[PDB]
């Protein structure tokens, strides 16, 4: 890919399981007799990760638009491999098993996913405000998970109840069918532009769609699809 970047051609780079790259290094180091570090990993983990990742950079001659995957052993995000990857990224997207087990197949945790370009100068003022509000909601939800778990929904205040309802609606709404998921899911794929996503979430945060039951936000596109499904259900 560096040859194409050096000549000016834009490159889309898709590496799969950078972890597997690190695990192999670990096995090679174990066979090489090096002194093991942390959970059996190689002593030269950071240097190997740097040597691989610093080559994945957009330079002044060309740009590499790199998308990587990382496998977390078990479900431990504190494992040395993902912990080393985290500092080598502009955008991080954290998929959680708990979200996935809720049939939310995108499975992305909004609170554990960040990006450097989520900047009002770069992405737009409305997009930035909508994203920050969609995080402040679901942060109020994460702060109240135990109270809902033990005492129940009733003990919360009225505005807290509203924020929790909107947060659960947002969790359902982040779900989205994929065109490549037709093999095991019957939902047709949906492509939601960034403008439509921002508008849908801004409308959801304003209050439009409060009357809609949460189940209608599951496996939908923009807010218009949810409204159409609600009207179909009457």
């Amino acid at each position: 890919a560096e040859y194409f970047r050096d000549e000016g051609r834009d490159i889309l780079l898709f590496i799969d399981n950078i972890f597997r790259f690190v695990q192999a290094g670990s096995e090679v180091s174990s066979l090489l007799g090096r002194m093991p570090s942390q959970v059996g990993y190689q002593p030269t983990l950071g240097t190997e990760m740097g040597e691989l990742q610093e080559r994945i950079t957009s330079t002044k001659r060309g740009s590499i638009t790199s998308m990587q995957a990382v496998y977390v052993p078990a479900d431990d995000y504190t494992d040395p491999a993902p912990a080393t990857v985290f500092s080598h990224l502009d955008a991080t997207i954290s998929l959680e098993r708990s979200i996935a087990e809720r049939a939310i197949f995108p499975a992305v945790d909004p609170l554990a996913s960040t990006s450097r370009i989520l900047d009002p100068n770069i992405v737009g003022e409305e997009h930035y405000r909508v994203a920050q509000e969609v995080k402040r909601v679901l942060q109020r939800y994460k702060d109240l998970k135990d109270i809902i778990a033990i005492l129940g929904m009733e003990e919360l205040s009225d505005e807290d109840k509203l924020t929790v309802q909107r947060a659960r609606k947002i969790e359902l709404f982040f779900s989205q069918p994929f065109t490549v998921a037709q093999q095991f899911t019957g939902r047709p794929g949906k492509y939601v532009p960034v403008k439509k996503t921002v508008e849908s979430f801004a409308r959801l945060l304003n209050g439009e769609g409060d009357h809609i039951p949460e189940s209608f936000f599951y496996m939908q596109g923009d807010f218009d699809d949810v409204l159409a499904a609600y009207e179909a259900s009457q």
């Binding site: 702060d143 998970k145 135990d146 109270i147 005492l151």
Partner: protein, 61 residues
């Protein structure tokens, strides 16, 4: 013709006189209100307070 009912607002027996010294009023002063209510309110409020404080303390799960 066969029964009498008195739907009286308040019925008192001053003839007893010792009713005050009697638990009817004496206990009403201590065995009632003092512990029947005040102690109930104190204990229940303390339980709610301990619950609220520990539910703040558990706000990291």
């Amino acid at each position: 013709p066969h029964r009498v009912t008195i739907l009286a607002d308040t019925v008192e027996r001053a003839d007893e006189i010792d009713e005050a010294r009697a638990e009817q009023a004496r206990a009403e002063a201590e065995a009632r209100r003092r512990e029947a209510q005040s102690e109930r309110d104190m204990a229940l409020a303390e339980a709610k307070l301990r619950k609220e404080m520990v539910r703040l303390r558990v706000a990291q799960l």
